[PDB]
Amino acid sequence: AKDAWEIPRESLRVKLGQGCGEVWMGTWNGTTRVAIKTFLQAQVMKKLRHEKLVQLYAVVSEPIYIVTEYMSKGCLLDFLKGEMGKYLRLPQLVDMAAQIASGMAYVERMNYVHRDLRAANILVGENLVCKVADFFPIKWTAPEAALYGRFTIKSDVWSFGILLTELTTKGRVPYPGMVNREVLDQVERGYRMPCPPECPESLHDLMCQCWRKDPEERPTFEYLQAFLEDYFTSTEPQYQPGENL
Ligand SMILES: */C=C\C(=O)Nc1ccc2ncnc(Nc3cccc(Br)c3)c2c1
DSSP states (O other): OOOTTBOOGGGBOOBOOOOOOOEEEEEETTTEEEEEEOOOOOHHHHHOOOTTBOOEEEEEOOOOEEEEEOOTTOBHHHHHHSGGGTTOOHHHHHHHHHHHHHHHHHHHHTTOOOSOOSGGGEEEOGGGOEEEOOOOOGGGSOHHHHTTOOOOHHHHHHHHHHHHHHHHTTSOOSSTTOOHHHHHHHHHTTOOOOOOTTOOHHHHHHHHHHTOSSGGGSOOHHHHHHHHHTIIIIIOTTOOOOSOO
16 A cells, blocks of 8 residues: 555666665656665655755665665765865865755654665765765664663764764874774773864864763754854964874
């Protein structure tokens, strides 16, 4: 018993592959360029709609397909590690952070929880447009949630702070040189990544706020969004560009 998102398989006509089934670029009803990911229960993608979340377009539930808006620049992790990462500077990265926070503030208002917020699950479009996608790996996960299964918007905040380090290192894997068990144990004892090179202290302070032991003391996404948007006026107005950031 299909809902109004259903389209016919025949409605769908170049690989980008990978992932636990594939990601093709395709054409929809001969006119519309889309992404197709070749479970279900996408039921969540139908109920969320915001300009910083990747948009559902259609599903085939028969040979399954999930169809979405096309994000030309691929995932944010590949984007950052690619050619165009040596040119990114703080302003572009802080702005990308802002669009992510904003997508997440929406998710926060809708009372949902992401659970896998990390640069690999963000898609990037034209004009440095970033949208939250792909609905657990311990380096990105809050303690209370890697250990005891307590996933909340507050654990998403934690991941956000880790994503912040992904943005400021141009996509380096966090806790560099540390292994899952060493990260678990060092974080338990109160360790936190230090300020990334060239990164202003105030942005590192923001990461540490995101990484508080007590979830409830972690900031909201509305707070993170607003702080990021206003960063270069309210927080770092004497920012001078550098060799990497
Ligand atoms: C970091 C690699 C990567 O995931 N890239 C990527 C590029 C484009 C794209 N378009 C559409 N969908 C996805 N991924 C995806 C993953 C899980 C579920 C779904 Br419906 C889509 C990508 C991924």
